[PDB]
Amino acid sequence: DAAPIKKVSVVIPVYNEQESLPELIRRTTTACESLGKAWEILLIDDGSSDSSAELMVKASQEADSHIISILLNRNYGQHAAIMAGFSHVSGDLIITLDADLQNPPEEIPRLVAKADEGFDVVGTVRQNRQDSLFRKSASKIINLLIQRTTGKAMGDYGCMLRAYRRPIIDTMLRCHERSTFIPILANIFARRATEIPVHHAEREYSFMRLINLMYDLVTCLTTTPLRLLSLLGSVIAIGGFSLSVLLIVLRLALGPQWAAEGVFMLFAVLFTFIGAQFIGMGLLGEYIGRIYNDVRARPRYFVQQVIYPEST
Amino acid sequence: DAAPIKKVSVVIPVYNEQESLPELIRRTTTACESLGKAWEILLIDDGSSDSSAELMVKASQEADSHIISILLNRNYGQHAAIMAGFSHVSGDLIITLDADLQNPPEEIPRLVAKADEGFDVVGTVRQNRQDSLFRKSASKIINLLIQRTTGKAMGDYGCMLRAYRRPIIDTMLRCHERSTFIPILANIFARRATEIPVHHAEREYSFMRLINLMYDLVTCLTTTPLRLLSLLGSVIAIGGFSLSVLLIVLRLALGPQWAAEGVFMLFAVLFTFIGAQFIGMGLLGEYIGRIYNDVRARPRYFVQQVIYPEST
Amino acid sequence: DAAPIKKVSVVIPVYNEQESLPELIRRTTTACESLGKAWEILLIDDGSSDSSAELMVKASQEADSHIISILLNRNYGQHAAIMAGFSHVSGDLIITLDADLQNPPEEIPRLVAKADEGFDVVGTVRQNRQDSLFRKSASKIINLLIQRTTGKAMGDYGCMLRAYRRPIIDTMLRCHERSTFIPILANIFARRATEIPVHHAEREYSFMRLINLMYDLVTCLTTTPLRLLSLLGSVIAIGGFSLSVLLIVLRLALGPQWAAEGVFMLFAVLFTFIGAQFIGMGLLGEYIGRIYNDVRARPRYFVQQVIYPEST
Amino acid sequence: DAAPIKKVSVVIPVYNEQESLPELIRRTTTACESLGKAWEILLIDDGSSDSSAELMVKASQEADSHIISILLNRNYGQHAAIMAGFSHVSGDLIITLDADLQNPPEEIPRLVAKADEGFDVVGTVRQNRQDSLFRKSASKIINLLIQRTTGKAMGDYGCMLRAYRRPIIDTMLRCHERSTFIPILANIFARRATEIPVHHAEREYSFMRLINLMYDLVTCLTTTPLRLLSLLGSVIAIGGFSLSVLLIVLRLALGPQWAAEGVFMLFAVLFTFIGAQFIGMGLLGEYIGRIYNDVRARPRYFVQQVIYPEST
């Protein structure tokens, strides 16, 4: 069906944005008014300490305002702020935006139009951002891994400008896992998805953040690394056993060859035991991985429609 | 008691079966009409992309149809589709069938008749399928393991044609474990079970699927592999300690014997420590295995009847 | 307070006891009638296959019977049968008995009288059973461990004849852990406990059962074995580092001493790394143990009475 | 806002305090009466065996008493007693005090006044207690770690005299984790916190308690130790591989150098494998740590206020 969008909800986490709030609000309001549909704006203050909350309250209390302000008691994180925002939306299309104006609000109409064609998730890709070699390689690896796992590609995973339909948000609200990534979670349930190119501000994370993010993504996406240990251990054990047998055969055939042959055979046995240790660790990982999946308990399926035979 | 069957429910997962749907529906309807009992057919579309959903809807909307069509929003897996089907059945006997017509629908009456004799689970075994040596050995090993664990044998675990009674499905719906195998889960609760031989289409998984399936079955059935590590480590440690003591005794008795005796004693100590490492890993596995069982939280018991003394 | 007992409930698991059921029922009924209090008897059939269920039903339907019969759909275990029995009791004192008549039913009045003095849990100890050396040593070790952990001693943990008050059973019904031991669980919540000596039939487990039972008890009682790994690793690492430093100091002081000194230093470094490995395994165990305790989620406390100040 | 306090609740765990109860009650009552606000006192008996319960009941039943007595069926721990006390409070400011009179009750007015300035958590620091070197170093390390993790410093973590506002207690009641530390849990949710200096009685834990407390704090605060294993393993593997390559290059360039060069190369390979083992253990820890966090399931966020646009 061609179920169209009739209301748009915008979610913007706020944390120490005193300088950028006025222009952000003005541009977002103008962009939303250009849609021709009903709309609302949600501002979530993640425990700011620079008078942002007062500005948000003033904006909410202004005449003819479409802004809903949500105040958290302290800082909890951008992911938690976004999840809190999702719990108070009312429209059928949800859009996430950055409060630093790094992504222009003027792109919202394009996302709305694309979603009106029948897509559940609409993403964005930043053009010619000129990242460093390591960051570009990491982006390529992450895109390939996500495409292989979820079946949907993602050119830019760190981009904040994205659109979701209401059922996607409803299902994502059912996942209580503390460590995750919202764009991956959306694609885990999306049927139809696409991405479009966008531009960005030319000028505006540390390495320690990058390493932790890589670990989080790998743990959220797959458990194969636990499986690779058994393969490595089996290879090592087979090599060690083959060398041990070959040493005895060679000594029995051509007699003694070196003064330290016994040491070499003992080293081969040691390598075999070391490989067995890797096999054991992989065996433990097999259970640990399933424990984790059962613990975080994502939904198994969703039913779209049920057709019963006519009663007559 | 001889509680007989009065309604039969058929569950068939569908995923890109546009070509086989008409003949499948016709033959299944004919077979069900030959029963003489009330019946219904459930078709679950697992996110097909070849117009199967439209055919299913058309079949459901046709006059005098006994077909219930269930549509999923996207692909989730055959196990999830079967579980969704179980949530919408209404009969007291449940039959699972394959949509590729590899197993003929004409065998259903035999399963119904066998179940009418008082069996809770009725299975099937394919005759003279002529599998490869490795697959046959794996089948034998799996059958032996399942027989030892659940107390019920299974000649063919990969066969899809099986019948279950309503209480079995109800109890299986209480298990939320993500990784499992439905036939094993049924036997875990079944009191009386049997299998019968069937024929199959002569002509129509990859090795990577086989290895993962073996791991899944082993993890679902038992935790002994975690126990074997302690035995291995104890054997290694005892051997190493015995060799270390023997070396000292021999040197003290008959004096020096080799130039590298100290190296040999150090290797023996190293082997003892390596065995201790296996013991430690087994110790960790002891807790991990119980954590997993507590996490997946299968039902502990089911009460069939309670008899109170007469009030008078 | 001297809250006395006014009704006694007897729980007896049944599994293939066709021969012993009549005498068991007769003697238990006589013993219960000698109490002078209200009483009931619960018989749980754990999937017997020797006509025990029919005998139990006949006994329940007999005139002036105090027997409640509970039938399970199949075999699940003695622990599960006892837990099912606890879910249907109605008295304020609960007694567990063995259906093989190994423990005479005539001891019940002594347990009732002892419980009437104000004890929550009353146990029994078998006299001069003349067990083997290993079994006696295991019993002593288990008794010491339980006394140290729960604060209550248990001379015989394998004895089935025991008495519990209703609140103890109610709290034990709140623990859903699959692997546990009921007598230990009772003492975990009991305030006042005691044991008394009893006699037993002279004549009537395998080693594999004993080893598994030891592992279950150790895992249910404590997590210290995970802590011992770090101590062992630290000792090994300190020894290795000390030897490595001593070798260098000795060589620098008195010059070269042996041809294989470098090999010895390398072995010392290897031992240090091996100790570090034990430290790491202990570090993992630290988290695993707490995960297990949080998973099995036993109750934290129970409130006996609350006194508010007089409203006036 | 300047929401002031209007009722004060005092929580005091009791365990064998027969001697100190009268003076404690008298001084606490005098201090509370000096506040000028409504107040109540909660006494929790943690299974005492020295007639403390009778004294508490007598105090509760005395005329014009503000004391609520809570009796536990047996001993469960100070943390459990405090949690039980929190479940029965009614005021908007909660104060915890020690029953041994080590911390004078006369400091309560200072805490109330400080909390009236708008603080959520108010702590205390003991001056010139003259602890040993190891204990002082441990205190410094714990303070630094807590400051880095929660963002709030704590000069003395072992001090019992502290004040909390009602929402903090309400959120802490939502955390069911068995192993934790209440002051850290409070700061995890507090927005504004402070500490003040206090005095203490000059004269009145064992080393085994200190080690367990350190492990508990480390496990409750962070998971970095699981991350350090991968770094250590990578360093070891890189060093071993570099040495192995250097040995071959040197031998090919300048020819043979030592009789035991092959042994050295084998040792280098062994070190590389040992480092790989550390990497694998860190890989397992990555999943274990996230499993633990998902298991103990702390609240993700709290909403303070929501402002909707004016309906007109």
Swiss-Prot record, chains A, B, C, D:
One BP annotation, GO: response to antibiotic
The EC number(s) this enzyme carries: 2.4.2.53
GO molecular function annotations of the record: phosphotransferase activity, for other substituted phosphate groups; undecaprenyl-phosphate 4-deoxy-4-formamido-L-arabinose transferase activity
GO CC annotation: plasma membrane
Cytoplasmic topology ranges: 1-228, 284-312
Primary location group: membrane
Similarity remark: Belongs to the glycosyltransferase 2 family.
Organism: Salmonella typhimurium (strain LT2 / SGSC1412 / ATCC 700720)
Induction: Induced by BasR.
Gene: arnC
The protein's name in its UniProt record: Undecaprenyl-phosphate 4-deoxy-4-formamido-L-arabinose transferase
Residue spans crossing the bilayer: 229-249, 263-283
Pathway assigned in UniProt: Glycolipid biosynthesis; 4-amino-4-deoxy-alpha-L-arabinose undecaprenyl phosphate biosynthesis; 4-amino-4-deoxy-alpha-L-arabinose undecaprenyl phosphate from UDP-4-deoxy-4-formamido-beta-L-arabinose and undecaprenyl phosphate: step 1/2; Bacterial outer membrane biogenesis; lipopolysaccharide biosynthesis
Pfam families, sorted: Glycos_transf_2
CDD domains tied to this protein: DPM1_like_bac
UniProt keywords, alphabetically: Antibiotic resistance, Cell inner membrane, Cell membrane, Glycosyltransferase, Lipid A biosynthesis, Lipid biosynthesis, Lipid metabolism, Lipopolysaccharide biosynthesis, Membrane, Transferase, Transmembrane, Transmembrane helix
HAMAP family: ArnC_transfer
